């Protein structure tokens, strides 16, 4: 009589990849993959989330807040996670900007980069004592107030000069200003208007040259006089003119230099920001909570260790991306049932 060792034969539909034996059929398998499905973005668990530079700044754009518009001056805090919902962010009012002429649109998205950011604990450059003559701190309707006065971006001053005379380039020296080793984001620009209004406001009706230097980053502009493009991301009809606006990043301890003439939207309140936040292209009416924020798939939570599908930037407790679905053998190589015995 014969007693022997043996293994089973059973349904073995699952196939597993091995080194010595090529691809083999197996009794059972533990999957390690999943193809997640597109869902809405949530709030990463152990970290705080941003998708609106500011929550207590109400009905506004992030660019609006960035630029320092009147109402949109809600004091904005810290998250260590930030979603980027505005790839090309817009303004929702105030003075008409000719945006597409500077890197300015991304100011919010640069800000987003930081963990901490602040309106500003002061305002560099004394708009009145500014090089050039005395200026009236130009104010403007088209940018309401807490009371409906004359709004102009807490960011910057509308340097309209008493003694309207033409100017050879003048040089402001924008200082560091910031608490600790924060980064500083200076903002500034220039108003330009038509033939007539130019002479009326400042003593010159010719194209005005502007030039900034900051950490070896030179930029040079030339104002436009006539035929400005239609007004947009603004409100109500000071359409004689437009402000070309730009930002300047001053690293810790460093000084900026703006060469300017007439229309000079001098800087004022200047961002101080520091800390690094993990950012991701999100698309957000932010609903609820996930373990992991995938640029595609969105709010997602960690079931299996790897995931199959679309690779993309992703932050949090995320499954690792994988070329192909992978399975762990949980069983026995297929054997055909036996009667090859005697």
Partner 1 sequence: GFFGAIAGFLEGGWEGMIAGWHGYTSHGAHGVAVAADLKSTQEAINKITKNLNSLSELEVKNLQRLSGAMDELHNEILELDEKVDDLRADTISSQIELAVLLSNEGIINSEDEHLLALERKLKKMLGPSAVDIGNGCFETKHKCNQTCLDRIAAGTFNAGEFSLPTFDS
Ligand X SMILES: *[C@@H]1O[C@H](CO)[C@@H](O)[C@H](O)[C@H]1NC(C)=O
Ligand Y SMILES: *[C@@H]1O[C@H](CO)[C@@H](O[C@@H]2O[C@H](CO)[C@@H](O)[C@H](O)[C@H]2NC(C)=O)[C@H](O)[C@H]1NC(C)=O
The residues that touch ligand Y, with contacts defined as CB under 6 A, are 12-13, 15, 25, 28, 30, 39, 42, 288-291, 299-301, 330-331, 334
Maximum Cα interatomic distance, the chain, rounded to a whole number of Å:
120
| Residue 197: other Cβ atoms inside 10 A | 15
Site pattern 232..251 for ligand X (x: CB under 6 A): --------------------
**From 7, 13, 90, 100, residue interacting with its own copies (rule: CB under 8 A):** 100
Q: By CB under 6 A, tell whether 48 contacts ligand X.
A: no
Considering only residues 128 to 157 of the shown chain, the ones binding ligand X according to CB under 6 A are: 133, 139, 145-147, 149-150
Q: By CB under 8 A, tell whether 171 contacts its own copies.
A: yes
Considering only residues 24 to 83 of the shown chain, the ones binding its own copies according to CB under 8 A are: none
Beta bridge partners of 292: 300, 316
Tell me how far, at minimum, the Cβ of 239 lies from partner 1, in Å. Answer: 26
Q: How far apart are CA 60 and CA 53, in angstroms?
A: 10
Q: How far apart are CA 63 and CA 232, in angstroms?
A: 14
CA nearest neighbour of 191 among 94, 54, 73, 300: 94
Q: By CB under 8 A, tell whether 230 contacts its own copies.
A: no
Q: By CB under 8 A, tell whether 224 contacts its own copies.
A: yes
**From 74, 131, 144, 203, residue interacting with its own copies (rule: CB under 8 A):** 131
Tell me how far, at minimum, the Cβ of 71 lies from ligand X, in Å. Answer: 11
Residue range at the interface with its own copies (CB under 8 A); choices 8-16, 34-42, 51-59, 211-219: 211-219
**In b/e form, how buried is each residue of 225-264, taking b as 16+ CB within 10 angstroms?**
eeebeebebbbeebeebbbbbbbbbbeeeeebebebbbbb
Q: By CB under 8 A, tell whether 119 contacts its own copies.
A: no
Q: By CB under 6 A, tell whether 171 contacts ligand X.
A: no
DSSP characters over 168-223: --EEE------STT-EEEEEEEEEE--HHHHHHHSS--S--EEEEEETTEEEEEE-
Sheet containing 314-316: give its strands across: 298-300, 292-294, 314-316
Using CB under 6 A as the criterion, which residues of the chain lie in contact with ligand X when the complex forms?
133, 139, 145-147, 149-150, 163, 165, 167
Using CB under 8 A as the criterion, which residues of the chain lie in contact with its own copies when the complex forms?
100-103, 106, 131, 168-171, 173, 206-207, 209, 211, 213, 215-216, 218-222, 224, 226-227, 229, 254-255, 257, 259
């Amino acid at each position: 009589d014969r007693i022997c060792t043996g293994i089973t034969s059973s349904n073995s539909p699952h196939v597993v990849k091995t080194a010595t034996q090529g691809e083999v059929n197996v009794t059972g398998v533990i999957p390690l993959t999943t193809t997640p499905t597109k869902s809405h973005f949530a709030n990463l668990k152990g970290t705080q989330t941003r998708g609106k530079l500011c929550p207590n700044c109400l009905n506004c754009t992030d660019l609006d807040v960035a630029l320092g518009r009147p109402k949109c001056m809600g004091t904005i805090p810290s998250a260590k996670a930030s979603i980027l919902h505005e790839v090309k962010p817009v303004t929702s009012g105030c003075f008409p900007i000719m945006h597409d002429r500077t890197k300015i649109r991304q100011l919010p998205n640069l800000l987003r980069g930081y963990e901490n950011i602040r309106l500003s604990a002061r305002n560099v450059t004394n708009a009145e004592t500014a090089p050039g003559g005395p200026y009236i701190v130009g104010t403007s309707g088209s940018c309401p107030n807490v009371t409906n006065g004359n709004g102009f971006f807490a960011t910057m001053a509308w340097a309209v000069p008493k003694n309207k005379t033409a100017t050879n380039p003048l040089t402001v020296e924008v200082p560091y200003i910031c608490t600790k080793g924060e980064d500083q984001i200076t903002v500034w620009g220039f108003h330009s208007d038509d033939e007539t209004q130019m002479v009326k406001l400042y003593g010159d009706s010719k194209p005005q040259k502007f030039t900034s230097s900051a950490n070896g980053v030179t930029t040079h502009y030339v104002s436009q006089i006539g035929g400005f493009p239609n007004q947009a991301e603004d409100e109500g009809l000071p359409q004689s003119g437009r402000i070309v606006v730009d930002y300047m990043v001053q690293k810790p301890g460093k000084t900026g230099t703006i060469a300017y003439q007439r229309g000079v939207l001098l800087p004022q309140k200047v961002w101080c920001a520091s800390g690094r936040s993990k950012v991701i292209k999100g698309s957000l009416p932010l609903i609820g909570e996930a373990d992991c924020l995938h640029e595609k798939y969105g709010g997602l939570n960690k079931s299996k260790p790897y995931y199959t599908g679309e690779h993309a930037k992703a932050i949090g407790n995320c499954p690792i991306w994988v070329k192909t679905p992978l399975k762990l053998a949980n069983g026995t190589k297929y054997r055909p049932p036996a009667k090859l015995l005697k």
